Amino acid sequence: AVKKFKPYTPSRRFMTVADFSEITKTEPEKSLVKPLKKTGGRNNQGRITVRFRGGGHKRLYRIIDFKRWDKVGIPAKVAAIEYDPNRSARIALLHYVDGEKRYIIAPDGLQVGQQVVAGPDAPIQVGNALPLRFIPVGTVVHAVELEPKKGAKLARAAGTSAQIQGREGDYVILRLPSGELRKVHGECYATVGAVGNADHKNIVLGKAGRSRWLGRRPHVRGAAMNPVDHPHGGGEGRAPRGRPPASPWGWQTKGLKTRKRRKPSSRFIIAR
Amino acid sequence: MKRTWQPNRRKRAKTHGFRARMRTPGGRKVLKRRRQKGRWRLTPAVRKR
RNA sequence: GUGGGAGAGGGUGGUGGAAUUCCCGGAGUAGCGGUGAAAUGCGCAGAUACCGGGAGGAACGCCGAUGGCGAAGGCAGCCACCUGGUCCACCCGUGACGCUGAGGCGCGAAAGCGUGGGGAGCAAACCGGAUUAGAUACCCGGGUAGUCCACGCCCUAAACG
RNA sequence: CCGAGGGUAGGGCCCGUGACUGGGGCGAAGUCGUAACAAGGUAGCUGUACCGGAAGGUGCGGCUGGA
RNA sequence: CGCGGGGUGGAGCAGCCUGGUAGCUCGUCGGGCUCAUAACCCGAAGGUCGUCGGUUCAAAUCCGGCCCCCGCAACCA
RNA sequence: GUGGUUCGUGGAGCCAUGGGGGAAUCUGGGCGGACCACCGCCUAAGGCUAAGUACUCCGGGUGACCGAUAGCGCACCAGUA
RNA sequence: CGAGCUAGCCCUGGCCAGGGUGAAGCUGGGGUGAGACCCAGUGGAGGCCCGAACCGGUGGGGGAUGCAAACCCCUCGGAUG
RNA sequence: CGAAUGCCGGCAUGAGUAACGAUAAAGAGGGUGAGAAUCCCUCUCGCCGUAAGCCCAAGGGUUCCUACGCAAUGGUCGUCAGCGUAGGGUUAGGCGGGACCUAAGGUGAAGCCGAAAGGCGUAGCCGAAGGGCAGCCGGUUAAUAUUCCGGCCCUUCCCGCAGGUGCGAUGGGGGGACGCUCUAGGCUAGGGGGACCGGAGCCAUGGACGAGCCCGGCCAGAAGCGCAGGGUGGGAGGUAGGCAAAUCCGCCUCCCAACAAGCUCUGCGUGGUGGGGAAGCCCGUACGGGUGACAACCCCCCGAAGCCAGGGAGCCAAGAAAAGCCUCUAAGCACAACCUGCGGGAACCCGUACCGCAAACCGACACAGGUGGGCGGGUGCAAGAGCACUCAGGCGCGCGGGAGAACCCUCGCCAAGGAACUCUGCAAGUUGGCCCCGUAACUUCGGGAGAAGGGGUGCUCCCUGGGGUGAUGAGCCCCGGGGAGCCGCAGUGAACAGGCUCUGGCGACUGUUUACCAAAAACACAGCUCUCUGCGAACUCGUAAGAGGAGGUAUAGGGAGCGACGCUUGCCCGGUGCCGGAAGGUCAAGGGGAGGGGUGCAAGCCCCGAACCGAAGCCCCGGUGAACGGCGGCCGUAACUAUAACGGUCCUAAGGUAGCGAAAUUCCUUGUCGGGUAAGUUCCGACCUGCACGAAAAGCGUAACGACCGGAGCGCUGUCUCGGCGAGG
RNA sequence: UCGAUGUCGGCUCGUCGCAUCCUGGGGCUGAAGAAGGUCCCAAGGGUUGGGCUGUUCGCCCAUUAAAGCGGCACGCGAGCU
Ligand SMILES: NC[C@@H]1O[C@H](O[C@H]2[C@@H](O)[C@H](O[C@@H]3[C@@H](O)[C@H](N)C[C@H](N)[C@H]3O[C@H]3O[C@H](CO)[C@@H](O)[C@H](O)[C@H]3N)O[C@@H]2CO)[C@H](N)[C@@H](O)[C@@H]1O
Ligand SMILES: [Mg+2]
Ligand SMILES: [Mg+2]
Ligand SMILES: [Mg+2]
Ligand SMILES: [Mg+2]
Ligand SMILES: [Mg+2]
Ligand SMILES: [Mg+2]
Ligand SMILES: [Mg+2]
Ligand SMILES: [Mg+2]
Ligand SMILES: [Mg+2]
Ligand SMILES: [Mg+2]
Ligand SMILES: [Mg+2]
Ligand SMILES: [Mg+2]
Ligand SMILES: [Mg+2]
Ligand SMILES: [Mg+2]
Ligand SMILES: [Mg+2]
Ligand SMILES: [Mg+2]
Ligand SMILES: [Mg+2]
Ligand SMILES: [Mg+2]
Ligand SMILES: [Mg+2]
Ligand SMILES: [Mg+2]
Ligand SMILES: [Mg+2]
Ligand SMILES: [Mg+2]
Ligand SMILES: [Mg+2]
Ligand SMILES: [Mg+2]
Ligand SMILES: [Mg+2]
Ligand SMILES: [Mg+2]
Ligand SMILES: [Mg+2]
Ligand SMILES: [Mg+2]
Ligand SMILES: [Mg+2]
Ligand SMILES: [Mg+2]
Ligand SMILES: [Mg+2]
Ligand SMILES: [Mg+2]
Ligand SMILES: [Mg+2]
Ligand SMILES: [Mg+2]
Ligand SMILES: [Mg+2]
Ligand SMILES: [Mg+2]
Ligand SMILES: [Mg+2]
Ligand SMILES: [Mg+2]
Ligand SMILES: [Mg+2]
Ligand SMILES: [Mg+2]
Ligand SMILES: [Mg+2]
Ligand SMILES: [Mg+2]
Ligand SMILES: [Mg+2]
Ligand SMILES: [Mg+2]
Ligand SMILES: [Mg+2]
Ligand SMILES: [Mg+2]
Ligand SMILES: [Mg+2]
Ligand SMILES: [Mg+2]
Ligand SMILES: [Mg+2]
Ligand SMILES: [Mg+2]
Ligand SMILES: [Mg+2]
Ligand SMILES: [Mg+2]
Ligand SMILES: [Mg+2]
Ligand SMILES: [Mg+2]
Ligand SMILES: [Mg+2]
Ligand SMILES: [Mg+2]
Ligand SMILES: [Mg+2]
Ligand SMILES: [Mg+2]
Ligand SMILES: [Mg+2]
Ligand SMILES: [Mg+2]
Ligand SMILES: [Mg+2]
Ligand SMILES: [Mg+2]
Ligand SMILES: [Mg+2]
Ligand SMILES: [Mg+2]
Ligand SMILES: [Mg+2]
Ligand SMILES: [Mg+2]
Ligand SMILES: [Mg+2]
Ligand SMILES: [Mg+2]
Ligand SMILES: [Mg+2]
Ligand SMILES: [Mg+2]
Ligand SMILES: [Mg+2]
Ligand SMILES: [Mg+2]
Ligand SMILES: [Mg+2]
Ligand SMILES: [Mg+2]
Ligand SMILES: [Mg+2]
Ligand SMILES: [Mg+2]
Ligand SMILES: [Mg+2]
Ligand SMILES: [Mg+2]
Ligand SMILES: [Mg+2]
Ligand SMILES: [Mg+2]
Ligand SMILES: [Mg+2]
Ligand SMILES: [Mg+2]
Ligand SMILES: [Mg+2]
Ligand SMILES: [Mg+2]
Ligand SMILES: [Mg+2]
Ligand SMILES: [Mg+2]
Ligand SMILES: [Mg+2]
Ligand SMILES: [Mg+2]
Ligand SMILES: [Mg+2]
Ligand SMILES: [Mg+2]
Ligand SMILES: [Mg+2]
Ligand SMILES: [Mg+2]
Ligand SMILES: [Mg+2]
Ligand SMILES: [Mg+2]
Ligand SMILES: [Mg+2]
Ligand SMILES: [Mg+2]
Ligand SMILES: [Mg+2]
Ligand SMILES: [Mg+2]
Ligand SMILES: [Mg+2]
Ligand SMILES: [Mg+2]
Ligand SMILES: [Mg+2]
Ligand SMILES: [Mg+2]
Ligand SMILES: [Mg+2]
Ligand SMILES: [Mg+2]
Ligand SMILES: [Mg+2]
Ligand SMILES: [Mg+2]
Ligand SMILES: [Mg+2]
Ligand SMILES: [Mg+2]
Ligand SMILES: [Mg+2]
Ligand SMILES: [Mg+2]
Ligand SMILES: [Mg+2]
Ligand SMILES: [Mg+2]
Ligand SMILES: [Mg+2]
Ligand SMILES: [Mg+2]
Ligand SMILES: [Mg+2]
Ligand SMILES: [Mg+2]
Ligand SMILES: [Mg+2]
Ligand SMILES: [Mg+2]
Ligand SMILES: [Mg+2]
Ligand SMILES: [Mg+2]
Ligand SMILES: [Mg+2]
Ligand SMILES: [Mg+2]
Ligand SMILES: [Mg+2]
């Protein structure tokens, strides 16, 4: 989708909005299973650690279910599909037959009315979740766990997905939304299908405000400020850095790798 | 234009208050000295009810 | 109408083997590539040649034809779903309901453009090596768009019988 | 009231002119190369795209007006 | 005016700083191939080294004086 | 690897130690300025211990100390206005 | 010792007169094999417009032991973000 | 002590000078007094009036009221006062806050961390104009009142009887409970009208004894009705979720509802009853009292931003929590308890005066400044909180009087010319609101547009078309149309209310910034690109624990640059950086000890110490330019000259492509041509010899947008020729 | 003169020098006349308005009897810009 606009105001011409057709006549969220008071704040205890944040629409947290072995075997019916301000993926709310309700990040396909479930059993269909081993090599899938019982963590962004590649001992090779081939443990669930609402990468914010709404204040270039507060700074009419591009704190930012070398997680990785 | 003193009872006891100064090691010393110097008033005289 | 037949006609979903390039392991040495001839290039940091494993993209050998199909552009491994034209037989129905067609409308190779994806091989530009008086070329070694998919544009041709 | 015309204001079409610039035509014997016609010494022509003093080269698909 | 760089056969460049020995590409001349010209092949010629001085036995080469040439600075007022 | 002593790596001991290695109970151990022999001196890895010493919020005495711009910032209801 | 000024953010309340312009979306009609599309009517979008409050502080004039250690007069910027 | 712009105190000078704090404005009569421009009174005049009037909050803390008073305080005076002395004054179960709740954030048992101090910290607690909660209208004081008094109406606790039921928790669930913009229906506050009801009174100066003028025609009010409107399904079985248990909730499955029909629940009318009640006139105030009064206390109209509220529609940026309240069950307990109706009893702490857009607060001042919320009437101008006048109400701003010079400030007008002024039309003028005609290049189809340029606007009479509220009518109130006619120089007759255009530069744009000399071409901005980051992420803060990132997960997050959009972004990897290289060379501690030394009679003890084994880093081998950066010099050549497509040669890592170019880059420079001018060191268009452009420190363009900067024209003018007169301070 | 002598140009106001641009007097002239050239006396008075530049100065446009050169802190900011 992606709503468009006629130019009746510069900016609201290039501006592009999402299409909330996929939003089952829902909107008002569900008390109980979410929301919780969401403590918004751009800095830690005192100081500001991440810069340029703050401001932007008030938000309510939708406490989603990111570990599904909670209900192994208990099937549930997908009730609605709603908007979640805390993420890029739309989310689906679903009523188990157990009578319990919980939200799930909604996969592309999954339609309201559908029945979905989790566990070793589970049929390989959009929405169902199973330990990685039991999933057919090659099938795509989202909401992966990295270590058994620790909760989902990979491919949860709007319309992202990972593809299974092979098996190898108690591990199974994956291919993350980034292109890295990772070795994940067999016992990590991963609900099947891709995340959906993949038009998300196409929304043209539009104006200055639009960014402000999502809570992101203006970002000033180092080049603009002085030597006192950033490498690229001073002296006359602009300047060409004058040294290898660096961050406010001073480490190179055009090429310098960061992953800490001797990490134990190294051996389970294979790509880029 | 607007100036720098905008009186506020709450802020004043809340900041230069007595329990305020007792709470920290530096403030307790603030008291010591003032006590040791004589000062009729150890801390500002906030008021009302 | 009825009853049948051929076919790379079109779209969608899935799928198979060959081969190339790359990665990994084994094994293995003093050269491999390439050309009219050479060099550039690659190779004792373990190449080429051989075996085993994996990744990935694109095109379908033999059948294959001087063949078929489509209105044209064009269409080729295999499977299924949707769908267009067409031919024969039976001479049952309608009953002149026909032909062409300014404009319109739709389709339209390749290259090209927009957005996102993909990227093995190839390959404008581009960089080297040779060739020549000079080579912005023909030859060689590299290589980016593009070539691939989805959507939307572009409307060209020795779009030729 | 209308009203020739005069005034003011903004359009439309057409003609003349302009430093400078784009390509074109024409002009016996100036310069640079060899693109085409013979297999033209890289078969050629073509649509498009890029590049090059110049003819032109190359990529992609096409064409017999070549084999 | 000041700083440093440079004048070499016809053209463009080496040659010095560690003084004795001028080298390369083109061009020019003679000869070949071609019907002829170019290409290509075979041979040959050409340099008071910007000038006036001395430095040493000996100066393109070291050192000062001028003749042009090129580049850099001419700031605070 | 450092600190302490006069000792700033010095021929650098002795005394404390953060890190690594890691003993013995008198024929046992440390020390006398690297180290070794001799000759000597002490007896580590538990603790307590007056007096002699410092100070002057406070009381008292004395002044070749000041005398209200001096002397405490304040002789006076001053850490006040 | 200070964020009772100023800067940013966090929690929670408030304020923005009155006029303009008229997006989508619907509704009917037209169009077609189904469309795209085109009409009106409706609708009320927007870091949209005029303009107070309010938030500013453009240009000039005054003031310059000032009313004022930043002020006053005329003018001017934005004003549902 | 004579000096130190010395330190402290005192007193001179300028000097009876400058000032006396908004140009809103004063005059008079009568008081009191030792003394009046300045205090009290009356009359006239002026000023504010979306306040310069009322009502809260903050802050202030006696400033409030009254008697007695002027030394000082008051910019003068002062009998007055916000000043001096004294006395009086603030009354709450229902208003605000607390014996209630939570937010950010504080604190913090458990726990973690840190040399000490101290840092972190789920429970809990603190924490508020947010949630919760029961008083409305009049009367009284010199000063207080939703507080005292009167009328009416409520809330809790505690203890009873009456009677219903399984009651029952800090525990389960429900609810509380939510954004922005635009809105419907019915109401109220508020306001206009009245031939109608009620009133003291008034006929002025030429007319009027008249449906004449002037004044006023309400407030609160329990249940019930009535009118609006919000909430809400009711059954029965099954149950594996809601961390114990539930009959509750949730989720299945059948039934009747789909309606607000019915339950409740607010609002608003009416309501037993209670209260108020003008002008004028009489009085004595520093003010209030009395009469008008048995006051009347009615009918239409307009009408909210407020009320019904959890109303509805739409949109994306997706919009607190906890308690009260309902329900559910657990331990316990069912002679308890709890629910409902009637009683009586109990109902505490603090705040209450006064100032409050200002002389009582922040600015050292009775300071032309700064200060949050509610009410803010009428008439007219299209509207409105705008503007002019003006109710209520409050002011004339705490030195006056004369004078009528220069000059200054603020304002008004001007012959003829009109930008000649000047760095610059700086300034000031022209223009101006509504309605109707009518509008170009260009363009991103929106715009450009209020383009440009025009005509209308008052009053009178006639005819006439819609609504709205009333019944389908009169009235009242809104919007229209046609036709005649009247007066001025002039009809948004006053006040508020764009000058216009053409053309370049820069930045896309609305925004932002040097509080107190710079608002811009600078910052930001959507968007593009590069690079990091697999999640105990990267990055940042922190010694740490820990937190932010993020309760996010590559369509995500950090960093860098560029900066809408269009067309594009060429070559150089030699140096620097970064990325990739289980080979080499070096490379520290450590391992190793060939070998040598010092002492001992010696075993031994203690030193040096070569091979060799040794990381990261550098070196080396490759890559990488939307990484740091860089992107040539000299000669010759065409059949008039001329120039050079063409050639030679030198060096480089490679030798600036496109596009632009005397530029925001051009030194020589007022380059040289062309354009505007009578004249043009600027400006616009060209050429290219680019001192010293050039492609993401982007290149060249670009509609729209601008308190940006340059050039021109039209209009208009005191800017000027060139001044003159008048006004007030 | 740095315990401060405000500094280019313009504007307002001037004032002085003569090495005179104009007007008056005069000699030589290759001075027929008219008009010039050059020089001597002479400073009493006069010495225009615009276009461009911050400009001084200059170049132009239209004139004029002429469109004079210089000084006074490159006259004059407790006079202005
Ligand atoms: N008519 C020829 C048109 O112009 C071009 O041709 C033009 C040129 O290429 C051509 O130039 C030629 C040159 O090619 C050739 N190699 C040398 C010759 N001297 C030149 O000649 C030219 O100049 C000379 C003297 O001035 C004249 O007398 C003669 O007419 C003229 N053609 O002269 C032509 C104009 O006259 C295109 N090549 C041709 O295809 C096109 O159709
Ligand atoms: Mg909640
Ligand atoms: Mg911190
Ligand atoms: Mg803290
Ligand atoms: Mg995109
Ligand atoms: Mg930025
Ligand atoms: Mg800066
Ligand atoms: Mg720095
Ligand atoms: Mg820099
Ligand atoms: Mg610069
Ligand atoms: Mg530089
Ligand atoms: Mg028949
Ligand atoms: Mg036909
Ligand atoms: Mg096509
Ligand atoms: Mg194609
Ligand atoms: Mg290739
Ligand atoms: Mg050749
Ligand atoms: Mg090749
Ligand atoms: Mg053909
Ligand atoms: Mg023309
Ligand atoms: Mg021409
Ligand atoms: Mg050819
Ligand atoms: Mg040829
Ligand atoms: Mg050929
Ligand atoms: Mg071609
Ligand atoms: Mg090529
Ligand atoms: Mg200086
Ligand atoms: Mg030491
Ligand atoms: Mg020892
Ligand atoms: Mg000893
Ligand atoms: Mg001893
Ligand atoms: Mg002791
Ligand atoms: Mg004293
Ligand atoms: Mg004395
Ligand atoms: Mg003293
Ligand atoms: Mg519409
Ligand atoms: Mg609107
Ligand atoms: Mg706006
Ligand atoms: Mg506005
Ligand atoms: Mg002396
Ligand atoms: Mg003194
Ligand atoms: Mg005087
Ligand atoms: Mg005087
Ligand atoms: Mg005076
Ligand atoms: Mg006054
Ligand atoms: Mg008035
Ligand atoms: Mg008092
Ligand atoms: Mg009083
Ligand atoms: Mg009195
Ligand atoms: Mg006085
Ligand atoms: Mg005063
Ligand atoms: Mg008296
Ligand atoms: Mg008093
Ligand atoms: Mg109590
Ligand atoms: Mg909290
Ligand atoms: Mg703490
Ligand atoms: Mg609490
Ligand atoms: Mg409260
Ligand atoms: Mg209360
Ligand atoms: Mg009172
Ligand atoms: Mg409960
Ligand atoms: Mg609850
Ligand atoms: Mg009369
Ligand atoms: Mg009532
Ligand atoms: Mg249970
Ligand atoms: Mg009365
Ligand atoms: Mg609602
Ligand atoms: Mg609680
Ligand atoms: Mg119960
Ligand atoms: Mg009170
Ligand atoms: Mg009061
Ligand atoms: Mg107020
Ligand atoms: Mg006053
Ligand atoms: Mg004031
Ligand atoms: Mg205010
Ligand atoms: Mg009102
Ligand atoms: Mg109006
Ligand atoms: Mg007003
Ligand atoms: Mg005039
Ligand atoms: Mg006139
Ligand atoms: Mg005129
Ligand atoms: Mg002028
Ligand atoms: Mg002038
Ligand atoms: Mg100008
Ligand atoms: Mg102006
Ligand atoms: Mg302009
Ligand atoms: Mg412009
Ligand atoms: Mg801008
Ligand atoms: Mg500001
Ligand atoms: Mg400033
Ligand atoms: Mg501005
Ligand atoms: Mg400013
Ligand atoms: Mg964390
Ligand atoms: Mg978080
Ligand atoms: Mg990023
Ligand atoms: Mg930038
Ligand atoms: Mg920029
Ligand atoms: Mg580049
Ligand atoms: Mg490199
Ligand atoms: Mg490089
Ligand atoms: Mg390299
Ligand atoms: Mg490396
Ligand atoms: Mg190494
Ligand atoms: Mg130029
Ligand atoms: Mg000209
Ligand atoms: Mg010119
Ligand atoms: Mg330049
Ligand atoms: Mg530049
Ligand atoms: Mg760049
Ligand atoms: Mg730019
Ligand atoms: Mg702006
Ligand atoms: Mg002009
Ligand atoms: Mg004047
Ligand atoms: Mg006057
Ligand atoms: Mg000086
Ligand atoms: Mg002096
Ligand atoms: Mg003389
Ligand atoms: Mg003469
Ligand atoms: Mg003079
Ligand atoms: Mg001078
Ligand atoms: Mg000068
Ligand atoms: Mg001067
Ligand atoms: Mg001055
Ligand atoms: Mg002076």
Check residue A106 and report its DSSP letter: P
Is there a contact between A90 and A159 (Cβ–Cβ < 8 Å)?
A: no
Measure CA A262 to chain center. Answer: 27
Cα–Cα distance list, A51 to A56, A112, A241, A258, B30 (Å): 15, 40, 21, 20, 36
Which among A31, A233, A19, A268 has a CA at the least distance from the CA of A154?
Answer: A268
- Between CA A169 and CA B26 the distance in angstroms is 62
Which among A30, A34, A116, A23 has a CA at the least distance from the CA of A77?
Answer: A116
Burial bucket for residue B28 (CB in 10 Å: 0-12, 13-18, 19+): exposed
Is there a contact between A133 and A172 (Cβ–Cβ < 8 Å)?
A: yes
Q: After which residues is chain A broken (C to N over 2.5 A)?
A: none
For residue A171, the cross-strand partners are: A168, A185
Q: Which nucleotide comes closest to B40 if you measure CA to C1'?
A: F79
CA of A78 to the centre of ligand 63 (A): 97
Q: Which nucleotides of H are covered by protein (CB under 7 A)?
A: 58-61, 103-107, 117-121, 173-177, 238-242, 250-252, 315-321, 350-351, 361-363, 369-371, 444-446, 508-510, 522-527, 530-541, 546-549, 551-565, 576-580, 627-629, 697-698, 703-704
